[PDB]
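Incident log, entry 3
Record: Peroxisome proliferator-activated receptor gamma (255 residues)
Problem: checksum mismatch between cached and fresh output.
Input:
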Amino acid sequence: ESADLRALAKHLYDSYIKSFPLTKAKARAILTGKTTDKSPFVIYDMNSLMMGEDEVAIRIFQGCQFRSVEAVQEITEYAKSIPGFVNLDLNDQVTLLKYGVHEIIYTMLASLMNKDGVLISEGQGFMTREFLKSLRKPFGDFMEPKFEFAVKFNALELDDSDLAIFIAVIILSGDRPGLLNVKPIEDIQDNLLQALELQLKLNHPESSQLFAKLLQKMTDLRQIVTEHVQLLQVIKKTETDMSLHPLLQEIYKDL
Ligand SMILES: C[C@H](O)c1ccc(CCOc2ccc(C[C@@H]3SC(=O)NC3=O)cc2)nc1
Ligand SMILES: CCCCCCCCC(=O)O
Ligand SMILES: CCCCCCCCC(=O)O
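Fresh output:
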């Protein structure tokens, strides 16, 4: 019954709004500078970066880490709202979060991105994509595979109500390594998938096979994760004085 699926979509959108302070709707309002009620400060070079706070590669990279830590907390809070998630085996809850978190982080990061750069500090700032490309040897290319994905993902023109369901689909995957009880997870995802299918058809009725196209984006997400992990392996060998946040460490451990 579509009634049940619409109620699920609404519940998820409500929890998403409650769990993620900076929505795509607010991020697009900032990025499209037309509503200059609160425009971002733009960091495009070394000089602008100094005044924006009014080694540099390491400080930027670690700011990304801290933002992911905060995102993990929001995503975990959201996950608990997904009907059935907290009733799963606790080992599996942890496993679902462990593998789902970075795929959600890069999905939602696209909301804060355009072709030219990315919002930072809760939207108060905007850091240029070419400034990020211009950082020292290992850090020079850490953001570019995120921007390339966002440009493509953002062409789908999903809004927060769509993303709320898609993020839930991601979490309740069931092909995650080491899951104990796959069937209850897959049963939740089937219902989530039905809701997402109906949501995209009602919200984007002119957008042919949006559902399929969105599901194909998972390949792109999983490949951003793998390339980030190997870059981390380079970082820890050349940057022995650089601490990684323990929450991030545990997520990355044995992935
Ligand atoms: C510090 C500087 O002002 C700055 C620049 C850009 C942004 C936008 C967010 O850009 C992100 C990039 C990567 C990750 C994934 C992290 S990064 C890591 O090492 N492990 C993970 O999970 C998250 C977010 N925010 C702050
Ligand atoms: C790049 C800013 C990192 C700390 C955020 C607090 C500073 C506020 C600001 O950017 O104006
Ligand atoms: C990546 C978007 C998920 C919500 C954005 C969190 C606030 C953005 C920020 O502080 O950089």
